[PDB]
Amino acid sequence: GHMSITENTSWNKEFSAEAVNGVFVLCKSSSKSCATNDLARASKEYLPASTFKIPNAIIGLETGVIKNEHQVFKWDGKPRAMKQWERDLTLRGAIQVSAVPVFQQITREVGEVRMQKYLKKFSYGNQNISGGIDKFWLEGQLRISAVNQVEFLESLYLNKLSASKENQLIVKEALVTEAAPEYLVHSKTGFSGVGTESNPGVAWWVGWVEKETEVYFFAFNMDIDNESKLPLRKSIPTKIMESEGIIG
């Protein structure tokens, strides 16, 4: 890439106030104007968890495993790890409620060869898909940094991923999470569970904010060993952006 990134450790106070280890990366306009609380962690690769839905959906559409933007994913009737997943879902619905089994099925149908090819085209992390075709991003070896998430998202925002513009637009449509006349947020959450206290889990929030004629890309991750701390994955980024002029 061509990222210019500045460490601003004053951003650490939002983390230390909550007794949390993580990083926030925030870029205005492009990856040529970025800042983070922690340069080292910004470039450190973690398990993507549900953030992998963004590339998975694009790859689904590119390969034709997902037939089109209007496809419904029907619940077969058999139980699932969350109740919110026990229903028929659109592409957007599945992404928004973060329905893992829908996406495990897409990936099985895609196959390792095509998966491997596309993660190379997207420069997605360490591009290591071993661990099982249906769980490399969930408990396998695939890892990605906050910096790389931002680069990836920027490419998607600009329709520069190696995929049709149509497919990128379909997925961007699925990622909208807040809409107002001159304020638009596209975003995706992730959470791997609580791991242990020796080896904590990871929580993510990644996306971008449009406000007037500006765009801001962001990626946040944190170590999480306690499910009660999970709200911080939005409140910390929100507070940093408030203090910068974005959400405030």
Ligand X SMILES: *C(=O)[C@H](NC(=O)/C(=N/OC(C)(C)C(=O)O)c1csc(N)n1)[C@@H]1NC(C(=O)O)=C(C[n+]2ccccc2)CS1
Return the biggest CA–CA distance within the chain. 50
Q: Is 189 annotated as a binding residue?
A: yes
In the list a copy of itself, ligand X, none, the entry touching 88 (Cβ below 5 to 8 angstroms by class) is a copy of itself
Residues 86, 92, 98, 103, CA torsion sign = positive
> Quick one: tokens of 80?
């699932």
Nearest approach, Cβ of residue 84 and ligand X (Å): 5
Which of the residues 31, 50, 145, 155 is marked catalytic? 50
How many other β-carbons are positioned within 10 Å of the β-carbon of residue 9?
Answer: 10
* 50 is a catalytic site residue: yes
CB of 67 to a copy of itself, least distance (A): 13
Using CA atoms, how far residue 167 sits from 61, 115, 170, 219, in Å, is: 6, 16, 5, 22
Residue 166 interface partner, choices a copy of itself, ligand X, none, CB cut-off 5-8 Å depending on type: a copy of itself
Query: Please, which of residues 76-105 interact with a copy of itself by CB under 8 A?
Result: 87-90, 92-93, 96-97
Among 77, 79, 83, 182, contact with a copy of itself (rule: CB under 8 A): 182
Residue 177 interacting partner from ligand X, a copy of itself, none (CB closer than 5 to 8 Å by kind): a copy of itself
Q: Which of 170, 232, 240, 241 binds a copy of itself (CB under 8 A)?
A: 170
- Nearer to ligand X by Cβ, of 50 and 149: the residue is 50
**CA geometry: angle 130, 172, 166, nearest 5 deg:** 90
Smallest separation (angstroms) from a copy of itself to the CB of 174? 9
Rank residues 81 and 97 by Cβ distance to a copy of itself and give the closer one: 97
Which of 217, 247, 248, 242 lies closest to 27 in space, CA to CA? 217
> Of 199 and 213, which CB lies nearer to a copy of itself in the complex structure?
213
Of 170 and 222, CB closest to a copy of itself: 170
Q: Quick check: 159 binds a copy of itself (CB under 8 A)?
A: yes
Cβ atoms of residues 87 and 78 within 8 Å: no
Residue among 34 and 170 whose Cβ is closer to a copy of itself: 170
For the chain, how far is it from start to end, CA to CA, in angstroms?
30
- CA quadruple 52, 1, 21, 26: dihedral sign: negative
Alpha-carbon distance values, 246 to 26, 144, 182, 223 (Å): 11, 26, 12, 25
| 191 annotated to bind ligand | yes
Q: How many CB atoms lie within 10 A of CB 144?
A: 28
**Contact residues for ligand X, defined by CB under 6 A:** 47, 49-50, 81-82, 84, 97-98, 100, 138-139, 189-193
Binding residues for a beta-lactam: 98, 189, 191, 233
Catalytic residues: 50
